Design an enzyme around this catalytic site. Structure first.
Site, short mmCIF file in Angstrom:
data_model
loop_
_atom_site.label_atom_id
_atom_site.label_comp_id
_atom_site.label_asym_id
_atom_site.label_seq_id
_atom_site.Cartn_x
_atom_site.Cartn_y
_atom_site.Cartn_z
N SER A 42 -27.28 61.05 2.38
CA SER A 42 -27.66 60.02 1.41
C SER A 42 -27.35 60.37 -0.02
O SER A 42 -27.54 59.52 -0.90
CB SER A 42 -29.14 59.69 1.52
OG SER A 42 -29.43 59.01 2.74
N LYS A 206 -31.07 62.78 -6.26
CA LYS A 206 -30.86 62.02 -5.04
C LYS A 206 -30.79 63.00 -3.88
O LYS A 206 -29.94 63.91 -3.89
CB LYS A 206 -29.56 61.21 -5.13
CG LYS A 206 -29.32 60.40 -3.82
CD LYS A 206 -30.25 59.14 -3.71
CE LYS A 206 -30.39 58.63 -2.28
NZ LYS A 206 -31.24 59.58 -1.46
N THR A 207 -31.63 62.78 -2.87
CA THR A 207 -31.65 63.65 -1.70
C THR A 207 -30.63 63.19 -0.64
O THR A 207 -30.14 62.05 -0.65
CB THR A 207 -33.03 63.67 -1.08
OG1 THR A 207 -33.42 62.31 -0.77
CG2 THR A 207 -34.03 64.25 -2.06
N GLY A 208 -30.36 64.08 0.30
CA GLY A 208 -29.67 63.69 1.52
C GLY A 208 -30.28 64.41 2.70
O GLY A 208 -30.69 65.59 2.60
#
Ligand SMILES: [Mg+2]
Ligand code: NA
Length: 266
Positions: A42, A206-208
Site C-alpha cells: 500500500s 504511508k504504510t504497506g
C-alpha cells in the site's frame, strides 16, 4: 555502525530489510539494500494520490466529483468505502481514505479514474522515477512473491520520488500541501516509524502490508525548526509476527535517530 546495526535487525526479522534516508537540512543520506527491489504494497497509494492531484491541477479531474460504486466493487480491507455504497464518495474523500486508512477499494476506484497501473507508472516515469512500477490492482498487488518484480520499488527510489512530489514543483502548491496533509493524518502507522521517532516531530507516512511477511512504511519527518527528513523502510520475507514486524520498523527509526548527529529523543 548503522549498516551493521541494520544487518543485525534484519537477522532478527528473518527477512530482507531495505532502508533509505535523506535529510534535506544537512544532505546526509543513507541506504541499506537501498537499490534492491521490494514489494510496495500500500505504499504505492501515496503515489496514486499524487497522480490524481496532478490530473486535478491539469483540469482533467475534480476533487469534488462524486464516484458512486456498488457492493460488488468492494475488495478486502475497505474500512471507509464499505460505509458509503449508498451515497458514494468524492475523489478527495477517496484519496483521503486510500492514504489515511489504506482503503483498497478507494485505491482501485482512483486507479480506474487515472486509467490504471500503466497510467500511474507512466506518471512516475514522467517525473523521473525510472524504477517504481505498478502492474496490478488491489488486492493482487500485495502478493509480494519473492523474486517477482511486479508492483515493486526500491527504498532509494521511493524516498527520492517522495522528495520530488512533496518538495518539487510537480504538483501545484495547493495539491502538494493536500498530499502532505493526508500523509500527516495517516491513521495506520502508529506502531511503525512513528513509534520510533521523537514525540516533538511532525510526521506524515504511508504504510504497506502484504503477504510473505511484508511490512513497510514511508515517511516525511519534520523535527522542530528543521527541513524534512525522508525515510523509506521495506521489510519482506520476515519470519516474525505482525507486531514484531511493526517493531522492526519502529526500531529502524530509533536507529536512524541514534546515528543522526544532534538528534535524540526527549
Ligand atoms: Mg538535524
Ligand atoms: Na451505489
Amino acid at each position: 555502525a548503522l549498516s551493521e546495526q541494520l544487518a543485525e535487525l534484519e537477522k532478527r526479522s528473518g527477512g530482507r530489510l531495505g532502508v533509505a534516508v535523506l535529510d534535506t537540512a544537512t544532505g546526509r543520506r543513507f541506504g541499506y539494500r537501498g537499490d534492491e527491489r521490494f514489494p510496495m504494497c500500500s505504499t504505492f497509494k501515496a503515489l496514486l494520490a499524487a497522480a490524481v492531484l496532478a490530473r486535478v491541477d491539469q483540469g482533467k479531474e475534480n476533487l469534488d466529483r462524486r464516484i458512486t460504486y456498488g457492493k460488488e466493487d468492494l475488495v478486502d480491507y475497505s474500512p471507509v468505502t464499505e460505509k458509503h455504497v449508498g451515497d458514494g464518495m468524492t475523489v478527495a474523500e477517496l484519496c483521503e481514505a486510500a492514504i489515511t486508512y489504506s482503503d483498497n477499494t478507494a485505491a482501485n476506484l482512483l486507479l480506474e479514474a487515472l486509467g490504471g497501473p500503466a497510467a500511474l507508472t507512466a506518471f512516475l516515469r514522467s517525473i523521473g522515477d525510472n524504477v517504481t512500477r505498478l502492474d496490478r490492482w488491489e488486492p493482487e498487488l500485495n502478493t509480494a512473491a519473492p523474486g517477482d518484480p511486479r508492483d515493486t520499488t526500491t527504498p532509494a527510489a521511493m524516498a527520492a520520488t517522495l522528495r520530488t512530489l512533496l518538495l518539487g514543483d510537480v504538483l501545484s502548491p495547493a495539491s502538494r500541501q493536500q498530499l502532505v496533509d493526508w500523509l500527516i493524518a495517516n491513521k495506520t502507522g502508529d506502531k511503525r516509524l512513528r513509534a520510533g521517532l521523537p514525540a516533538d516531530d511532525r510526521v506524515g507516512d504511508k504504510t504497506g502490508t502484504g503477504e510473505h511477511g511484508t511490512t513497510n512504511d514511508i515517511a516525511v519527518v519534520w523535527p522542530p525548526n528543521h527541513a524534512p527528513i525522508f525515510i523509506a523502510v521495506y521489510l519482506t520475507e520476515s519470519q516474525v509476527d505482525a507486531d514484531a514486524r511493526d517493531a522492526v520498523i519502529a526500531e529502524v527509526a530509533r536507529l536512524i535517530v541514534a546515528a543522526w548527529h544532534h538528534h535524540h529523543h526527549h
